[PDB]
Amino acid sequence: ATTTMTMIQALRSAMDVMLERDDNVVVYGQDVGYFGGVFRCTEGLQTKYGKSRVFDAPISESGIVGTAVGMGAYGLRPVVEIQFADYFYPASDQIVSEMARLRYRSAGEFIAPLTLRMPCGGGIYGGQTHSQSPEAMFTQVCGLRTVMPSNPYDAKGLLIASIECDDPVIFLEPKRLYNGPFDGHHDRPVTPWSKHPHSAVPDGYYTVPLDKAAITRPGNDVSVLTYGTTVYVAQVAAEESGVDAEVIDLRSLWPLDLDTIVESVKKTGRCVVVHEATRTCGFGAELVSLVQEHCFHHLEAPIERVTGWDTPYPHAQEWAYFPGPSRVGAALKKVMEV
């Protein structure tokens, strides 16, 4: 059947399903066990499956990821959490030097079928260490697979898919989208998921295929490459600009759905990349580089990118930082210009 879920409940369900599906699946991390996570994402799981399967961990990111790598080498399927994406850094070494290269350097002898869920994104007065978007810290690591959902349905499906994937998955979750969709309008109080499309979530097992982007708003004027919170930002902004922009939710950051992208820009003739992450050397640059490589002649204008400023995430200046419908909108007009 089906139940109406929030992103939180969807992710929780995904873990509940896989926790049941596969004996080797284990869930751990800080406050993940008894308390059920500082975001409710793991509520009741420990009660249901036992401490041996879902448990609380010491405050040690490299410890969490490191032990997980060892657990994988043995043959488990660790779904492990890091409270905020901003705190992954201490695990950098285990992530890049070990988790990503375990299969390659052993010629397949040992593998790391791990999933790291890290809540990410800003737009919540998070400040410097509660709101960064470090996807570019991972997409550049050979051997990793980075994924970010934008709605409960995809959140559950992409998570189940991610856990089952035998490659290590960095699963980024936009906490801005935890309780409901968010377009960048803080003036208008935010609505829950129940009043929106894609909160209808199947109760049991199902997947959303990796490496497959999703056209949210079909258009002919501009291709808009984006993911996470900026998907809903691009949508609303497309409506306000008037511009008939095609909105693509990459869903899988890297590896990505290259065809869907090239197909859109090829038809369109112009594209705008949008992400919360800071400009310089962000994920947007690879996207710009890819489009430029495969859609050069079909390109009717320079590829634009609306991103967060090259600055640490501020608190008071929140809405001057976060790329909102206005700032995105301007770029949609800018590309459509002769």
């Binding site: 800080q30 008894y34 448990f55 405050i59 901003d86 410097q128 260490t129 090259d310 008071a316």
Partner: protein
């Protein structure tokens, strides 16, 4: 057949919601029980002390033992003045948090003695590397409340220009190093600062801070190692409040061990001290400071206390521990305990208490009025957007110039 199946072991707090905590796990000692070693004591000869409890004020509020020696009542007064100011300030900010005047706040309810205690044992030039929970340090060094609150508000007047989440203070003049949300990082940083002081033949020392939970973080071990390797003039402070958000200290690795024990392990003289005994806090802090300043080496102090309040304004402790847990904590209330002692020796009274409360309540309310005059969450009165790009580098580089211009 021969070996029984191995089992994963996961520690659990004896106390859960709807039950009663069994505070036996705290290896405690009676007041005056623990000795006072020399400032030159070798790290190895500190082992017992890492598994016991330096404590001065007993159940009845009388001072016992060698840690009670040479204690100027004027300092205890400043201590009482510091703890109350802290607590009252804390209360106030929680309220301004509800009323949506402030974004976020973390209390230090029940831990007011520690930061203040050590702060009073140090020099103003001895830089502290605090966590978000040592506002008592700021209070014991009489930092402008107006500027503290302004930061809490992200006013046009925020000294950090609204770049930083509420409570993530930074006061160089107060010897209070810029707070970062990233746990443990400051502990290593403190050691480095001490190494610097040592490198330049200076006499200043570093005061490092960390919680029970954060000891599991890698920069904890890095700090002890470096403090030891180079015999750096650091005081290394572990604040064991039993909790890390929802996580009992046993998951931090406290089961059958002490945090003080980990200092002995890396060859650092270590004390485990009653964190709610101000006199003991002052006495232990002075010892460590003097040890460091004499050039006899770093010290690790594990402050045994209790996180009486919510983890934060976003937290609800009633979801993972008994609601009445603090009532049963064997080391009670720092303010309550100092009060009983300070009255009994005749340097305090219900009178001075009530007045001192009254004056601080006034002081915070005034400063809050003073600070709000410069903005709120509701008021768009906040620092400029053009300031958002300053100080990223010393000189605003070309690309940020474009990014500011484009706004």
């Amino acid at each position: 057949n021969e070996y029984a199946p191995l089992r994963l072991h996961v520690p659990e707090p004896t106390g859960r919601p709807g039950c009663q905590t069994d505070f036996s796990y705290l290896r405690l000692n009676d007041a005056g029980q623990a000795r006072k070693p020399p400032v030159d004591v070798d790290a190895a000869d500190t082992a017992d002390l890492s598994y016991s409890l330096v404590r001065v004020l007993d159940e009845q509020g009388d001072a016992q033992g060698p840690w009670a020696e040479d204690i100027d009542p004027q300092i205890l007064r400043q201590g009482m003045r510091a703890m109350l100011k802290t607590r009252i300030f804390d209360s106030r900010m929680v309220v301004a948090q509800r009323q949506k005047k402030m974004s976020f706040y973390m209390q230090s309810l029940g831990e007011e003695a520690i930061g203040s205690g050590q702060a009073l044992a140090l020099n103003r030039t001895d830089m502290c590397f605090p966590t978000y929970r040592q506002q008592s340090i700021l209070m014991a060094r009489d930092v402008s409340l107006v500027e503290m609150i302004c930061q809490l508000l992200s006013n046009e007047r925020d000294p950090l220009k609204g770049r930083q989440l509420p409570i993530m203070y930074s006061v160089r003049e107060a010897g209070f190093f810029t707070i970062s949300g990233n746990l443990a990082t400051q502990f290593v940083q403190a050691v480095g600062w001490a190494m610097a002081s040592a490198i330049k033949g200076d006499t200043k020392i570093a005061s490092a801070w960390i919680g029970d939970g954060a000891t599991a973080e890698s920069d904890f071990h890095t700090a002890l190692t470096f403090a030891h390797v180079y015999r750096a003039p650091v005081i290394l402070n572990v604040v064991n409040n039993q909790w890390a958000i929802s996580t009992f200290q046993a998951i931090a690795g406290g089961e059958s061990t002490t945090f003080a024990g980990r200092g002995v392990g890396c060859g650092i003289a270590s004390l485990r001290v009653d964190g709610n005994d101000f006199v003991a806090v002052y006495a232990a802090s002075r010892w460590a400071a003097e040890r460091a300043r004499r050039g006899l080496g770093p010290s690790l102090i594990e402050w045994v206390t209790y996180r009486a309040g919510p983890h934060s304004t976003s937290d609800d402790p009633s979801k993972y521990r008994p609601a009445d847990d603090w009532s049963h904590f064997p080391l009670g209330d720092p303010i309550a305990r100092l009060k009983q002692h300070l009255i009994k020796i005749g340097h305090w009274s219900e009178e001075e208490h009530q007045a001192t409360t009254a004056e601080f309540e006034a002081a915070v309310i005034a400063a809050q009025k003073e600070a709000e005059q410069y903005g709120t969450l509701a008021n768009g009165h906040i620092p400029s957007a053009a300031s958002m790009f300053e100080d990223v580098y010393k000189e605003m580089p070309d690309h940020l110039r474009r990014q500011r211009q484009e706004l």
